Every structure is written in structure tokens, then in C-alpha cells.
């Protein structure tokens, strides 16, 4: 559990760096209601598919810069 | 640039087109690493690419606005630009070269090195480490 929380927080550390907000607005669809009422514990005990899609968008789009991007790709590979 | 996005948020100016290339194109998978960045923008990379495009004047302007502290270089950029681009001052060129060797050569941000080396013709042994990406 502690490691898992570490991972979620790590992703968020990533997101803070930049252009997270714009993607969020554009991305959210029908699933969106579920997304918005997601608690931290929900991430702690993960809801894997949505994050994977979002992360993919972070990488596909320009937002992630340099080293960050490499890290998600690593992440998707490792736990995705 | 001519294909979706934002459509870039701002005007179609050449500078912004290059910012887009640098930002959207592959400088970031999901952004990061070893550039000098102010307000979300790699200035040196920008100058390098603008220069690459042939937009020397714009590159010069970027440097002017830059917030940097190698400022002597700033001087040497502008006159390189002013002339036929073979900026040959009977004066300083020598001085620029020494600084490159001592300070810049063993260190720095790849793009910064590129700009110095290319503009200066600083070190004739030739090749730019990190950012030669195409033939």
C-alpha cells in the first residue's frame, strides 16, 4: 500500500509540472462524472484504466517534458 | 503548426511556430531535461532553431529579451547579424573565443554551446554533441 501511494503521488508530481488543466478539460467525456468523484484513496487503491488513458494522452501530447515523459512510458510498461 | 492544436493559441508569427515545434515536437515526450528554461521555454533551443530556420533576426531579438548573463555574447550576436553574417570585427572575436574555451566549452546546455560555436566559429574541430538530430 505504501508503495502504491508513492506511485500515485509520483504521477501527480509529474502532472503538476505543466499543461495538465487543458488536457483535462478536453478529454473528459461520459466517464467524466466518475472521474471527478475520484478520491485520493481511489488512486491509492487504483482505478487503472482511466489513468492509463490519461497518461497516454499526457505522453502523446506535448505536455510531458523530457525526463518526465520517459518515466510515464516506463510506468505504462511496468504497471499498465 | 499547420494542423490542429492550440490552431495554436497565439498569432502565426514565425517565433511562435518554432516555439510550437520545440514544445509540441519531440523536445518533450512529457516534458523535461537539461535545458535552460524561463517561463516554460527553452530560450537557447529557440535561438538555435530560429537560426536553423534562417530567421537570424528573430533569434537575435529572442536573445535581447532573454534574461541571461553571458551578455557579452549578446553583443557578438548583434553585428554578426548586422553584417553579411560573416561577422568579422577586427576587434573582439578573439575575446569571444577565449570565453568559449574557458567557460562554455567544458560544461553547458547543448543549445547554448551550439549557438556559441556556430555563430563564433569558436572551435574548428567540428561537431555538436547533443543536438545534431538530422543529416
The technique is cryo-EM
**Deposited resolution, Å:** 21.4
Residues 6+ apart with CB under 8 A from B51: B59, B115, B118, B119
DSSP state of B67: -
Give the other-Cβ count within 10 Å of A51's Cβ.
19
Q: Is B107 helix (H, G, I), strand (E, B) or coil?
A: coil
Largest CA distance in chain B: 49
Mutant choice from B29, B35, B37, B41 vs A, greatest count of A C-beta within 10 A: B29
Query: Rounded to whole angstroms, what are the CA distances from B95 to A52, B67, B80, B103, B119?
Result: 54, 22, 15, 12, 14
Shortest CA distance to A63 belongs to which of B38, B111, B5?
A: B5
Looking at chain B, after which residues does the C atom sit over 2.5 Å from the next written N, breaking the chain? Answer: 6
Give the other-Cβ count within 10 Å of A78's Cβ.
8
The three cell numbers of residue B102 are: 574557458
Chain A residues touching residue B34 (CB < 8 angstroms): 66
- For chain A, say whether B27 makes contact (Cβ under 8 Å): yes
Chain B residues touching residue A65 (CB < 8 angstroms): 27-33
Encode burial over A5-36: b for 16+ CB neighbours within 10 A, e otherwise: eeebeebeebbebbbeeebeeebeeeeeeebe
Q: Cα–Cα distance between B131 and B51 in angstroms, integer?
A: 14
Q: Cα–Cα distance between A55 and A58 in angstroms, integer?
A: 5
Q: Cα–Cα distance between B57 and B78 in angstroms, integer?
A: 9
Amino acid at each position: 500500500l505504501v508503495r502504491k501511494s508513492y506511485q500515485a503521488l509520483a504521477l501527480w508530481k509529474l502532472l503538476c509540472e505543466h499543461q495538465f488543466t487543458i488536457i483535462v478539460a478536453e478529454l473528459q467525456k461520459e466517464l467524466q462524472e466518475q472521474l471527478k468523484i475520484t478520491t485520493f484513496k481511489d488512486l491509492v487503491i487504483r482505478d487503472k484504466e482511466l489513468t492509463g488513458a490519461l497518461i497516454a494522452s499526457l505522453i502523446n501530447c506535448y505536455i510531458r517534458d523530457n525526463a518526465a515523459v520517459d518515466g510515464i512510458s516506463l510506468h505504462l510498461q511496468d504497471i499498465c | 503548426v499547420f494542423g490542429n492544436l492550440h490552431q495554436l493559441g497565439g498569432v502565426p508569427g514565425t517565433y511562435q511556430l518554432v516555439r510550437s515545434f520545440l514544445n509540441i515536437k519531440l523536445p518533450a515526450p512529457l516534458p523535461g531535461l537539461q535545458d535552460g528554461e524561463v517561463e516554460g521555454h527553452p530560450v537557447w533551443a529557440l535561438i538555435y532553431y530560429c537560426m536553423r530556420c534562417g530567421d537570424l533576426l528573430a533569434a537575435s531579438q529572442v536573445v535581447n529579451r532573454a534574461q541571461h548573463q553571458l551578455g557579452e555574447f549578446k553583443t557578438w550576436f548583434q553585428e554578426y547579424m548586422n553584417s553579411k553574417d560573416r561577422r568579422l570585427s577586427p576587434a573582439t572575436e578573439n575575446k569571444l573565443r577565449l570565453h568559449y574555451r574557458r567557460a562554455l566549452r567544458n560544461n553547458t546546455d547543448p543549445y547554448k554551446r551550439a549557438v556559441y560555436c556556430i555563430i563564433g566559429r569558436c572551435d574548428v574541430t567540428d561537431n555538436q554533441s547533443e543536438v545534431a538530430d538530422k543529416t
